[PDB]
Design a protein around this ligand. Structure first.
Ligand code: ATP
Ligand code: MG
Lengths: 387, 316
């Protein structure tokens, strides 16, 4: 495959994996583990269910599996299941012997330190990687853009987080989590569909509503317009066919679902949504740099892909500088240049950025935490990895 | 149902329970009725003793037309001091109760029949005075028109029995006339009410139902009620008149006729509501035939074969 560093975005919803200088993930698959179950459902000799089924092998066969997720909110909940993703990732997707390899990992900006420690311990002591580096997921997405300033916001399956950057300095006091992302919009889609009477409360049906959200949802650009189309008109109604063959009608739930990123109170969170979170983050930066942040807001991660999200977010920041800085005076609004970067690749920007960064530091062997350094200092060897 | 019950169902069912019961529980129950009437049923001193009480805004008028002698005739020993906030009250004791199941049944009926027993007093005053005028007119047929003329103005009853109505009635030697000065204030009931009142008059003019009272209608008042209080001609009232002849209140019929004429306006009010429930079931039938006129715009494709729950299937 390659002799250069391996890179692994072990995301909350998808693992993406490959090597330094890859222009796109070598593989990606759901970060799911399954165990065999029987369920008053179809059975077939067309496939054989092993005791542990993971990644693509599980998601293609999940009618037969008790599906479980090793991660939530960007943290590993169960390491015995994350070991069964990492075994699969290295031994039967990449088909590697990890002994002495160097690997780049990722995690979100405010995780428990016990998560990075036990993730590095596992890399040194199950697999025996020769070197490890862990990067904050949103600073990777800035190397993908070929860029060195402008606030980058990453929204994944687990967490939405923001990292302001100016002239290659990373503003660690302004980095932030919004604990609402692509999974809370999916648990919410199940809860909207339950008002229509459709039940999706089996563990294997969660991937079906992920595929449904990912297919049919869009972010409303103007809520009183989509509420007009929703209440006055049939035009929003769309038929989705489940893998069961059942057809379900979905309507206001197309815009009303991804709206929880802009209004977290719909999912019971008191936090401010994307527009108000990015504004209260840029507007907390020092006076000299705020222009260079509004001139380059960078979107990233799969939950930034909803149709209309770049346009809703740009509008909803022009609309919010207008309330909170101009106090509703139109005279200065045309002077407020805000720009959203919303590139075609952006779902993979954390991986594509990781694959750039893992080239920049492939040969600098002191830059990685080495296995030989881990085995003498333990967890204190990770203090190499910044503030 | 095609026609309203005359009694309050709740008091009938409730007393039918307690008169059968081996072990009575306590109650405190206000119970609404038509024409703004309201009952209160409670067990104030013991679970053994039920106090039934009635509230009705026109009861002060009904006491002028001889009501208390009719209620003392009907309820006898069970009559009680009026409950504070109520016009009339009756105290029935479940241990001192009548013996047979048909005595219990007719007492539970009689107590539930209270609204039409309190509102019957002006009708019995008119029927019993028409029985006197019928004898005086049979003594001198040339004096009879003048007895009718004076009874038409001196023996007239008016009851303002709810604020959008008046019932006016009087005896003459061969009849009791009763006029409902009737109004529907709810505008969708006023629109249907024109149809329901018009077709009611036009029904009486057919061979099948000539045996009924002579009904008449207008919107101004009959000449003999044009100066009664609260009757006003311009205010979009309608004046349904029934003429009950001596054959419509013969001794076998009197009690059904009193029960059945009081409920008049309430059957029209009920049937105006129950006609919206009809028009809806007839509208959603025409909607279901316009479906066919759109279905010929869908192109013909077979939707795939599925199990009963909508899951996909693999045979044929
Ligand atoms: N077009 C789309 N429309 C809606 N949602 C999308 C779309 N494309 C991807 N997603 C959602 O993005 C999520 C996966 O994105 P991503 O791989 O960036 O998350 P992750 O990196 O695994 O999560 P995290 O970074 O929080 O650990 C899933 O919820 C998926 O349904
Ligand atoms: Mg991610």
């Amino acid at each position: 495959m390659e002799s250069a560093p391996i890179v692994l975005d072990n995301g909350t919803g998808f693992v993406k994996v490959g090597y330094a200088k890859d222009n796109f993930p070598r593989f990606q698959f759901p970060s799911i583990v399954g165990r065999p179950i029987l369920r008053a459902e179809e059975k077939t000799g067309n496939v054989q269910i092993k005791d542990v089924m993971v990644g693509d092998e599980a998601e293609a066969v999940r009618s037969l599996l008790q599906v479980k997720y090793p991660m939530e909110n960007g943290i590993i909940r169960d390491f015995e299941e994350m070991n069964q993703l990492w075994d699969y990732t290295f031994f039967e997707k990449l088909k590697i012997d990890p002994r002495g390899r160097k690997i780049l990992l990722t995690e979100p900006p405010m995780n428990p330190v016990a998560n990075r420690e036990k993730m590095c311990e596992t890399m040194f002591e199950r697999y025996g990687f020769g070197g490890v580096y862990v990067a904050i997921q949103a600073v990777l997405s800035l190397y993908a853009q070929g860029l060195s300033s402008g606030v980058v916001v990453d929204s994944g399956d687990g967490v939405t987080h923001i990292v302001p950057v100016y002239e290659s300095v990373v503003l660690n006091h302004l980095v932030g989590r919004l604990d609402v992302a692509g999974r809370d919009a999916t648990r919410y889609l199940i809860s909207l569909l339950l008002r229509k009477g459709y039940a999706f409360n089996r563990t294997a049906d969660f991937e079906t509503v992920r595929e449904m959200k990912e297919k049919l949802c869009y972010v409303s650009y103007d809520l009183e317009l989509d509420h007009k189309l929703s209440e006055e008109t049939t035009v929003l109604m769309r038929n989705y066919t489940l893998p069961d063959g059942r057809v379900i009608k979905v309507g206001s739930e197309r815009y009303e679902c991804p709206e929880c990123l802009f209004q977290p109170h719909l999912v019971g969170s008191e936090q401010p949504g994307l527009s108000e979170f990015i504004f209260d983050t840029i507007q907390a930066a020092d006076v000299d740099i705020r222009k260079y942040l509004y001139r380059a807001i960078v979107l990233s991660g799969g939950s930034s892909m909803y149709a209309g999200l770049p346009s809703r977010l740009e509008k909803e920041i022009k609309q919010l500088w207008f309330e909170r800085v101009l106090h509703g005076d139109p005279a200065r609004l045309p002077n407020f240049k805000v720009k959203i970067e919303d590139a075609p690749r952006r779902r993979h920007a954390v991986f594509i950025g990781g694959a750039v960064l893992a080239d920049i530091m492939a040969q600098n062997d002191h830059m990685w935490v080495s296995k030989a350094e881990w085995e003498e200092y333990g967890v204190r060897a990770l203090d190499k990895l910044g503030p | 149902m095609l026609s309203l019950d005359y009694n309050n169902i709740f008091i009938y069912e409730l007393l039918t329970e307690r008169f059968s019961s081996e072990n009575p529980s306590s109650i405190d129950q206000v119970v609404t009725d038509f024409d703004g009437v309201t009952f209160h049923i409670s067990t104030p001193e013991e679970k053994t003793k039920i106090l039934i009480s009635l509230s009705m805004k026109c009861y002060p008028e009904l006491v002028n037309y001889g009501t208390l002698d009719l209620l003392k005739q009907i309820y006898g020993a069970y009559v009680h001091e009026p409950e504070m906030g109520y016009n009339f009250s009756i105290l029935i004791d479940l241990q001192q109760l009548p013996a047979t199941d048909e005595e219990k049944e007719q007492l539970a009926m009689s107590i539930s029949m209270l609204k039409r027993n309190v509102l019957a007093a002006p009708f019995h005053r008119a029927f019993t005075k028409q029985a006197e005028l019928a004898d005086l007119a049979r003594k001198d047929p040339e004096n009879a028109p003048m007895l009718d003329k004076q009874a038409t103005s001196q023996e007239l009853m008016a009851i303002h029995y709810r604020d959008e109505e008046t019932i006016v009635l009087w005896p003459e030697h061969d009849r009791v006339t009763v006029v409902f000065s009737t109004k529907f204030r709810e505008e969708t009931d006023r629109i249907f009410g024109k149809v329901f009142l018009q077709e009611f008059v036009d029904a009486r003019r057919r061979p099948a139902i000539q045996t009924a009272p002579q009904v008449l209608f207008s919107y101004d008042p009959p000449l003999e009620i044009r100066d009664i209080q609260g009757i006003q001609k311009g205010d979009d009232f309608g004046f349904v008149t029934f003429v009950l002849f001596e054959r419509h209140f013969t001794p076998q019929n009197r009690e059904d006729c009193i029960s059945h004429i009081q409920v008049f306006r309430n059957t029209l009010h009920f049937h105006i509501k129950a006609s919206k429930a009809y028009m809806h079931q007839r509208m959603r039938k025409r909607v279901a035939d316009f479906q066919k006129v759109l279905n010929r715009a869908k192109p013909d494709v077979e939707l795939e074969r599925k199990t009963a729950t909508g899951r996909s299937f693999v045979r044929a």
